[PDB]
Every structure is written in C-alpha cells, then in structure tokens.
Amino acid sequence: PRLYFENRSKFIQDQKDKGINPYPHKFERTISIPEFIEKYKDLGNGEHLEDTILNITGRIMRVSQKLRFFDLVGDGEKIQVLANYSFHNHEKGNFAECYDKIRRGDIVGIVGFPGKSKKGELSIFPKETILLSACLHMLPMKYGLTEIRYRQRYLDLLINESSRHTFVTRTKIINFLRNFLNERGFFEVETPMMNLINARPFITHHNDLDLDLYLRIATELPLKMLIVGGIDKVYEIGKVFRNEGIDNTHNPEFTSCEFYWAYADYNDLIKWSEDFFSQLVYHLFGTYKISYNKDGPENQPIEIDFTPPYPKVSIVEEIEKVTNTILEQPFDSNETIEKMINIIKEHKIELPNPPTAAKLLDQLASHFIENKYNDKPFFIVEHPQIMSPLAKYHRTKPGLTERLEMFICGKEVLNAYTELNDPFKQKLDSAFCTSLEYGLPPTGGLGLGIDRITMFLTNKNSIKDVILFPTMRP
Amino acid sequence: PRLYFENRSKFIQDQKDKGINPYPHKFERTISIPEFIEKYKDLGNGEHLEDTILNITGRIMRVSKLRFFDLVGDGEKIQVLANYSFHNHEKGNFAECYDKIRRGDIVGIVGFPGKSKKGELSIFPKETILLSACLHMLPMTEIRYRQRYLDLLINESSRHTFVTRTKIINFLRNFLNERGFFEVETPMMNLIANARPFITHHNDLDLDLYLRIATELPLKMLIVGGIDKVYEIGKVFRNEGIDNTHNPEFTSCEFYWAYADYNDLIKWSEDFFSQLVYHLFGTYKISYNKDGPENQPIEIDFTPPYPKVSIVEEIEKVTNTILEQPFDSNETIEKMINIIKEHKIELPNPPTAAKLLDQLASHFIENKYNDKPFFIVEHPQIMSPLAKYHRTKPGLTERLEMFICGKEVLNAYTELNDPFKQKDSAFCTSLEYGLPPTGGLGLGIDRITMFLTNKNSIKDVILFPTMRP
Numbered sequence: 001p002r003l004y005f006e007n008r009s010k011f012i013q014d015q016k017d018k019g020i021n022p023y024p025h026k027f028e029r030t031i032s033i034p035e036f037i038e039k040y041k042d043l044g045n046g047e048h049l050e051d052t053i054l055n056i057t058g059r060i061m062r063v064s065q066k067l068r069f070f071d072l073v074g075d076g077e078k079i080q081v082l083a084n085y086s087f088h089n090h091e092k093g094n095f096a097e098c099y100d101k102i103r104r105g106d107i108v109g110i111v112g113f114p115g116k117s118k119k120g121e122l123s124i125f126p127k128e129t130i131l132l133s134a135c136l137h138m139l140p141m142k143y144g145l146t147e148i149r150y151r152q153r154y155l156d157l158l159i160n161e162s163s164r165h166t167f168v169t170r171t172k173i174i175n176f177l178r179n180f181l182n183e184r185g186f187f188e189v190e191t192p193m194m195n196l197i198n199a200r201p202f203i204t205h206h207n208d209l210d211l212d213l214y215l216r217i218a219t220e221l222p223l224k225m226l227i228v229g230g231i232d233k234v235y236e237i238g239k240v241f242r243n244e245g246i247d248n249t250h251n252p253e254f255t256s257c258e259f260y261w262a263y264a265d266y267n268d269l270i271k272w273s274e275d276f277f278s279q280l281v282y283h284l285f286g287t288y289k290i291s292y293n294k295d296g297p298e299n300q301p302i303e304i305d306f307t308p309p310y311p312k313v314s315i316v317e318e319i320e321k322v323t324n325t326i327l328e329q330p331f332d333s334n335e336t337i338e339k340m341i342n343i344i345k346e347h348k349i350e351l352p353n354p355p356t357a358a359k360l361l362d363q364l365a366s367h368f369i370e371n372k373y374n375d376k377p378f379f380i381v382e383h384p385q386i387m388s389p390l391a392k393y394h395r396t397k398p399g400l401t402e403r404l405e406m407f408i409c410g411k412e413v414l415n416a417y418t419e420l421n422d423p424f425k426q427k428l429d430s431a432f433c434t435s436l437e438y439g440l441p442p443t444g445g446l447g448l449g450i451d452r453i454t455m456f457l458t459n460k461n462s463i464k465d466v467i468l469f470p471t472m473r474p
Numbered sequence: 475p476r477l478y479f480e481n482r483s484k485f486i487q488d489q490k491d492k493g494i495n496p497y498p499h500k501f502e503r504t505i506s507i508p509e510f511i512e513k514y515k516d517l518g519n520g521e522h523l524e525d526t527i528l529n530i531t532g533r534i535m536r537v538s539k540l541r542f543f544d545l546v547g548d549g550e551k552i553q554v555l556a557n558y559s560f561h562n563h564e565k566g567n568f569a570e571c572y573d574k575i576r577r578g579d580i581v582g583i584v585g586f587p588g589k590s591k592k593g594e595l596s597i598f599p600k601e602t603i604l605l606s607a608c609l610h611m612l613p614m615t616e617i618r619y620r621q622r623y624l625d626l627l628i629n630e631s632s633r634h635t636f637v638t639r640t641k642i643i644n645f646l647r648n649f650l651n652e653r654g655f656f657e658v659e660t661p662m663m664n665l666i667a668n669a670r671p672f673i674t675h676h677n678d679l680d681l682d683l684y685l686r687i688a689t690e691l692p693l694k695m696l697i698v699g700g701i702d703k704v705y706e707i708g709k710v711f712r713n714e715g716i717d718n719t720h721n722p723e724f725t726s727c728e729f730y731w732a733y734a735d736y737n738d739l740i741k742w743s744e745d746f747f748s749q750l751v752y753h754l755f756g757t758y759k760i761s762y763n764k765d766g767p768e769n770q771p772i773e774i775d776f777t778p779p780y781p782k783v784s785i786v787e788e789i790e791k792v793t794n795t796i797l798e799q800p801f802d803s804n805e806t807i808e809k810m811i812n813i814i815k816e817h818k819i820e821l822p823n824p825p826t827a828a829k830l831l832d833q834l835a836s837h838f839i840e841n842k843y844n845d846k847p848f849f850i851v852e853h854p855q856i857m858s859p860l861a862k863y864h865r866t867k868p869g870l871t872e873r874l875e876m877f878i879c880g881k882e883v884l885n886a887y888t889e890l891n892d893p894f895k896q897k898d899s900a901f902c903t904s905l906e907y908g909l910p911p912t913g914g915l916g917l918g919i920d921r922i923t924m925f926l927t928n929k930n931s932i933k934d935v936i937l938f939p940t941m942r943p
C-alpha cells in the first residue's frame with residue numbers, strides 16, 4: 001500500500017547491519033534464460049537432470065509449507081523456480097528464512113539443477129538463492145498499465161510483453177536498412193549535428209566559440225558535399241531536430257536516414273523504395289501484407305499490401321482532376337493563388353498563413369490526394385519546382401521536378417528526388433553552393449522517416465510508442 | 475584565379491546557348507572504376523577488346539591525334555586513351571570535343587577496355603559527354619577542414635582515414651551484436667559526467683532542454699527494464715574547450731552489460747582493441763607519429779594483456795608521499811596542492827580534491843607507457859560518483875580507464891546499484907526498482923580513430939569539424 005518502500009529500505013539497512021550484503025558485486029552465471037529454455041524444453045514431465053548444477057539469474061515476478069514457486073523472467077522469457085526444503089543446501093542457512101526475504105521485482109542469483117514438474121512445467125530447482133538487487137517499490141500487476149509508460153519506460157518493458165517487441169522490431173528495422181545499403185555498396189558517414197545554417201530550427205550557444213549554432217533539420221547539404229568529394233554512394237542514419245509542434249506523427253527530435261546515390265535518378269529511386277519496403281516487410285513478416293489498426297485497438301484494423309509496384313500519383317494533375325479546376329503557371333501568380341484560396345474556402349479546409357503558393361499546394365494535396373489509398377503505399381510525384389528548391393527540374397514537364405513522396409496510411413515516410421546539380425540553376429550555405437561549383441555529378445537522393453516506418457510495422461498510433469524515452473512535459 | 479571561373483562560367487552559358495546540356499539528367503553507366511580494374515587488369519600490353527562497348531563515369535584529374543587522361547572513381551585511377559581512330563565523328567569533331575575537357579570535370583565515357591603498348595590500363599572512348607563541369611581550379615592547411623571534398627579528392631590518404639573510421643565503427647557494431655548486444659537510441663535532449671552542457675529552447679513546449687553529455691543514465695534504466703545487453707553509438711555534446719584532442723561534439727559508444735563487472739570489462743577491452751587492430755593491419759603493432767610526420771614515429775603494441783596501474787598507489791609511489799583518507803580533508807588537499815607547485819604544474823581552479831587527483835594522475839601516471847595501451851584502475855569514490863565501491867579497498871571504486879599515448883579512450887566500471895549509496899530524479903527512481911549487478915563501458919570513437927589512422931588531431935578524423943567562420 002505504497003509504504004512498502006520504507007519497509008523494504010529498512011530491511012536492506014537491517015541486512016547490512018546483520019553483515020549481509022544485499023547488493024553483491026558479481027554473481028557468475030553460467031547460462032541465460034533464453035538459452036535455458038532452448039536447452040531444456042525437451043525434457044519429459046517430472047524429469048530432473050539431477051547432476052547438472054547451473055548458475056542462473058532473473059527477476060522474480062510472482063512469489064507463489066516446505067516448498068515455494070516463483071516466476072523468473074530474463075530477456076523477456078520466464079521459467080519457474082521450484083525451491084524445496086529437501087533440496088536446499090542447509091549449510092548456507094535456514095531455508096524458510098532465506099525465501100521469506102524474496103519479493104516480487106527482486107533480482108536473484110540461483111544455483112540449481114534444470115528440471116520439469118509433474119504438470120510438465122519447465123523449471124529450475126535451487127540449492128541456493130542469493131539476493132543480487134532488490135526491488136524497493138510496489139511493482140504494478142500484470143496488465144496494470146497510460147503516461148507511466150513513457151516516463152518510466154523500464155516499467156513498460158518489464159510488465160507489458162508487447163512493449164519489448166516494439167523496440168526489438170525497431171532495431172531489426174534499422175539493422176536491415178543498414179545492411180540493405182551496405183550490401184549495395186553504400187558508405188556510412190557522420191556529419192555535424194550543429195551548424196551555422198524548410199522548418200524552424202533549434203538554437204543553442206557554443207561557449208568556446210561564443211557563437212549561436214543551429215541544430216540540423218536534415219543531413220542533405222553535407223551529404224551532397226561528400227558526393228562532390230567522390231564518395232559516390234553515401235548515407236547517414238541519425239537524429240535531426242525540428243522546432244515545430246508535437247502530435248501522434250510528430251516529435252521535435254526524430255530518426256532519419258538519407259542517402260545519396262551518384263549517377264542515379266528519380267526512376268532508380270522509385271525502384272529502390274519499392275524494393276526496400278517490400279523486402280523489409282517480408283523480412284519481418286514472411287508476407288508483403290500486414291494488419292494495421294488505423295483507427296485504434298478498439299476499432300477494426302485495415303490491411304496494407306506492400307507488394308510492388310505501388311501507385312504513382314502526380315501532384316498537379318490529380319488536384320486539377322479532383323477539383324475540375326486548371327492551375328495556370330506560374331503557380332505564384334495572382335490569378336492562380338487567388339484560385340487556390342477559393343478552393344480551400346469552397347471545400348472549407350483550414351487555410352495556411354501566410355498563403356504562399358507552395359504552402360497552398362501542400363494543404364490542397366493534403367486534403368485531396370493524401371487519403372487516396374490506405375490499403376497500399378503510394379507515391380505522389382513530380383512536385384512543382386516552387387515546392388522543391390533543391391530538386392532537379394523535370395526533364396520533360398516544365399515547372400515540375402523529378403520528386404517523390406511515399407505515403408503509408410496518409411502519412412509521409414519517404415521523400416526523394418533527382419538532385420539539382422547545376423550551380424547556375426540554384427537560385428542555404430556559402431560552403432554548399434561553393435561545392436556545387438566544383439561539380440556535383442548526376443545524383444539521386446532519398447530520406448526515410450524511421451519512426452513513422454517503425455509505427456506502421458509495429459502497429460502503433462502514436463510516435464511516442466516507438467521512441468524509448470519520448471520528450472515529455474514534466 | 476577568379477578568371478578561370480569566369481571563363482568556365484561562360485563556357486557553360488555558351489554550351490547551354492548552343493543547344494547542348496552541360497548538366498544532363500542521367501547517364502547509363504554499366505561498370506564502376508574499381509570494377510573496371512578488377513575485370514580487366516590481366517590484359518596483355520597493347521591488347522584491346524574493341525568489341526566490348528562499356529559505359530563508364532568518373533572525374534578527370536590529369537590531361538596529357540591522341541589525348542591522354544586520368545579518370546578517378548571511388549578512389550582509383552584509370553587512363554583514358556582517346557584515339558582519332560575510335561572517335562565517332564558523327565557525334566562531334568574529335569578535337570572540338572576533347573579541347574573543352576579540363577581538370578576536375580566529371581564525364582561519361584562510352585568506349586572499350588584495353589592497355590597501351592606501354593602496358594598501362596586504359597579506357598578507349600568513342601564518345602565523351604560532359605556530365606558535370608568543375609568551375610574552379612583544383613589545387614595540384616585550413617582548406618582541408620573547411621572544404622573536405624577537395625581533401626578527399628587530392629590527398630589519397632584522406633579517404634583511407636575516413637574509410638578506416640567507418641570500418642572501426644562497423645567492427646564495433648558487429649563485435650557487440652555478435653555478443654548478444656542490443657543497439658538503441660536514448661533521447662538527444664534532456665531536462666538535466668562532470669562537463670558543461672549545451673542548452674537550447676523548445677518553442678512549442680516552452681521549455682529549456684540540455685543536450686546529452688553522456689548516454690549512461692538512460693541506458694542503465696533499460697537494464698532495469700530487462701534489456702541486459704544494451705548499447706548506443708551516437709554523438710554527445712560537451713560545451714567545453716577545443717583542441718587537437720577535444721571537440722564540443724564527439725562520437726561515443728557506451729554499452730551496458732548486466733551480470734558483468736570490472737574484471738569482465740578488462741577482458742572485453744583487451745579482447746576488442748587487440749582484435750580490432752589485428753582486423754585493420756594483420757599485426758598487433760602499429761606505428762604512430764606522436765610528435766608529427768616530420769619527427770620519428772613510436773610503435774604501439776596491442777598484444778594482450780595490457781598493464782593495470784592503480785591510480786592512488788602510483789601517484790603515492792612516484793612522489794614518495796602518502797595521501798591520507800578522506801582525500802577531501804584539509805590535510806590531504808594541501809599535500810596535493812603542494813606537489814602541484816613543487817613540480818611546476820598548472821593548478822586547477824577550483825582546486826577540489828577530485829580535480830587535484832585528476833591533474834596529479836594526468837602528469838605523474840598518464841605517460842607511464844607509450845609502446846602499449848594501459849589501464850588506470852581503482853579510482854577513489856570522490857572521482858567516481860556512478861561507480862560501485864571497490865570490494866576490498868575502502869575509498870576506492872571498481873573503475874578502469876584505458877590510455878593510448880597519454881590520451882584517454884576508454885572509461886568503464888562496475889555500476890553502483892544500491893540506490894542508498896548514490897548519495898536525475900527519473901534515473902534515481904529506477905535504481906529503486908532494482909538494477910542488477912552490471913558492468914558498463916564507454917569509448918571515444920574519434921580518439922581511437924586518431925590512433926589507428928596515425929593522426930595528430932581530432933579534426934583529421936571528423937568529416938566537417940566545427941570551425942570559426
């Protein structure tokens with residue numbers, strides 16, 4: 001009843017006073033729990049491997065006359081502990097005084113032999129049990145977990161069995177991406193997180209240079225510079241910081257991977273995306289199809305099919321076609337801008353302030369196009385050069401660029417394009433523009449939204465679920 | 475100077491004006507330069523394979539009826555041997571084409587593989603487009619760190635450096651993963667080691683956040699969560715001084731090993747460093763120019779085991795003094811401060827017991843060896859707030875630090891888990907939920923790279939080091 005702590009703290013101090021160390025230095029375990037289940041799951045009911053002493057450790061998660069049961073968890077797997085007065089080595093002390101000290105949450109060292117119960121329960125049978133690290137608080141009951149999960153993540157990880165899955169998956173995702181690129185000749189680099197130079201940035205102050213720096217909003221410019229350097233296939237997975245608002249799909253600090261492929265272009269990157277996504281999902285599910293609760297764990301889930309190829313939708317054409325309106329170039333012209341503001345009002349969507357063309361197009365696309373498909377990922381392609389300042393101009397469609405955005409359930413996870421490489425047509429940094437002048441070969445570059453990808457492949461509604469310690473208000 | 479540019483700027487506008495695109499969208503290459511060298515290195519001199527048309531790209535880096543070039547791709551050079559005989563004059567005039575190709579230019583080449591009468595491996599072109607023009611004059615200081623891209627292009631070893639750095643990180647990742655470890659990302663910004671933080675403001679939360687100075691606290695929490703083998707390779711931000719061995723943002727790996735201890739973490743370190751060095755050289759011994767490429771190199775030997783030198787014992791034994799505990803007593807502080815003046819070393823201000831032990835160690839132990847890496851073990855508790863108390867030696871902790879050529883590259887120890895002896899609120903609370911016996915270790919990736927690439931300065935091992943404008 002929440003005063004357990006003071007009790008437990010006193011007991012610890014009492015243990016110290018009686019000369020016993022309750023936080024011992026090293027216990028030499030000879031096997032882990034996942035191994036123990038792997039090694040011993042094929043013993044027959046009631047069988048004991050009486051002549052196999054093992055040193056094993058875990059965390060007690062249920063303390064169940066002269067006999068005691070326990071639940072021992074470790075690396076996310078449990079076995080049972082069957083301590084028996086008959087089997088206890090009495091030289092180490094009074095059996096019932098030894099086990100009456102063990103609480104739920106306690107971390108223990110067990111010297112015993114591997115066996116099974118009459119029921120066929122795989123267990124370990126100890127001669128000796130030592131307390132290695134005690135749990136002083138009252139641990140939440142199995143399925144007793146809100147907003148405790150995000151602050152006290154360790155508690156989430158210990159009680160809620162799927163929580164470990166989420167984060168194991170997350171790493172399998174990154175491990176994949178790393179290999180997928182490395183196999184394809186790519187070369188992982190580190191670029192600076194702090195700099196002198198579209199999103200509002202985080203600002204911080206360097207002391208020994210007495211200068212205000214800006215935490216990076218992407219990894220684009222330094223990466224492109226390395227292509228100039230002759231590192232033809234280059235990539236970086238890392239944190240990036242944007243100072244905008246927070247929601248279920250947005251978090252101020254988030255993981256992103258960008259790569260730059262020299263001599264490639266739009267079409268190569270479309271192939272890349274399709275190849276990567278389909279394979280990744282298959283690597284994790286043995287199928288290109290997954291279930292996904294778009295509306296929540298209470299509502300019916302939808303099915304997403306990752307079988308390539310995926311649908312391509314052109315940004316301009318589609319909006320025209322959905323509204324029966326035609327949008328004359330330049331898109332920033334007074335006739336065309338005023339036309340869009342009419343469409344935003346005529347369909348009653350929230351209007352962006354300030355109303356600049358590219359910002360009006362994004363909101364239009366956002367409402368009309370971005371919910372075209374939920375059952376498969378799809379691309380929105382060939383964005384106008386006004387939305388796409390660093391992208392190469394479309395080689396046949398004037399005004400547009402060779403740009404792609406991939407969408408899963410209406411949210412953006414990928415963004416790539418052919419890199420504008422002619423320094424003249426680049427109408428940002430002095431160093432960057434200087435690099436262009438030294439010759440950037442035809443390049444195609446892409447970026448992934450790791451956390452959003454992780455959300456979809458772990459069936460989560462909130463980005464906070466797939467980040468270990470999300471940035472939260474106190 | 476500037477004129478070279480102005481001319482090339484115009485040569486572009488002229489080519490654009492003339493109906494030719496000097497920056498085309500795509501070129502369909504079928505082989506890379508390293509691949510070209512692999513498949514065709516065994517050709518006999520002067521022998522051609524005129525019936526194998528290949529598409530190749532690269533950068534022109536030397537310009538010699540016949541026109542010679544050097545084409546570089548991914549860190550290797552091959553010769554372009556342009557011959558009036560093979561030139562497809564339907565595309566353009568042989569001379570009117572190759573006259574406009576300057577040094578630095580990136581070009582697409584359609585030709586065939588073969589060697590010159592000399593036996594030199596070349597590429598024999600029919601057509602040669604301009605893929606991306608180089609406007610500035612390439613050099614034949616402070617340019618290296620500012621414009622790394624030039625450095626990677628001209629200096630052949632600059633690439634070997636950064637390739638080695640990536641090989642080093644990859645090695646580490648596999649080493650840990652192979653051993654059951656689990657890579658994570660703990661948050662880059664926090665609400666709260668001993669070092670000055672970077673501070674920044676989040677607008678929409680209206681809250682001021684500190685950039686992480688270490689990964690120690692949130693990793694240790696995950697061990698509480700049951701992730702018994704957890705790690706992170708990532709940047710850490712310390713708002714400190716800058717020099718050959720310090721850079722406000724650097725790359726660290728911290729890993730946390732539940733059920734291990736001080737003794738295991740030595741074996742781990744000895745194992746890892748030896749194995750890494752053998753991976754990159756095929757020998758446990760390397761050469762390192764401590765004083766510079768002009769002065770004689772010393773030899774660094776990575777054969778296990780390495781020496782363990784006890785920090786208190788060693789200072790004591792070296793100065794003929796004893797330092798009575800507590801080290802923070804008026805008695806012992808004065809005895810320390812006196813040794814600092816008596817051997818004309820810089821006194822740290824504030825002179826706290828913890829910092830005076832540091833400088834004393836810094837001068838009197840930290841250059842004990844240079845021909846082998848060595849550990850400094852058993853630091854006092856007043857130096858080691860997160861380190862578990864030594865199990866036989868009162869006042870000491872179960873800590874280790876490993877040094878190569880006077881510089882610290884590894885800091886590790888048995889973790890303190892008795893939340894009582896821990897004299898962040900989130901972090902403190904977790905220890906109350908039970909942190910098992912754990913070992914835990916940190917590496918300086920940027921320094922380790924300096925030593926394994928023979929480099930005097932941390933800047934040489936960072937692609938775009940943070941400079942003054």
Ligand SMILES: C[C@@H]1CCC[C@H](C[C@@H]2Cc3cc(O)cc(O)c3C(=O)O2)O1
Binds near residue numbers: 243244249254449
């Ligand atoms: C670098 C990647 C490229 C693919 C799409 C994503 C788009 C969003 C933008 C974004 C902005 C933001 O302020 C916070 C975010 O988590 C995210 C996010 O989840 O990724 O960005």
Ligand SMILES: C[C@@H]1CCC[C@H](C[C@@H]2Cc3cc(O)cc(O)c3C(=O)O2)O1
Binds near residue numbers: 715719724917918920
């Ligand atoms: C956290 C890691 C553990 C291993 C040793 C290094 C210690 C030094 C400290 C340090 C501080 C600093 O402000 C900048 C640095 O590059 C370095 C560095 O290279 O490593 O730190």
Ligand SMILES: N[C@@H](CCCC[NH3+])C(=O)O
Binds near residue numbers: 218258417446447
């Ligand atoms: N920097 C882009 C991703 C890569 C686009 C291609 N250079 C973004 O964050 O949207």
Ligand SMILES: N[C@@H](CCCC[NH3+])C(=O)O
Binds near residue numbers: 667688689690914
């Ligand atoms: N956080 C330590 C490295 C880990 C030492 C063992 N917990 C440091 O900043 O150097």
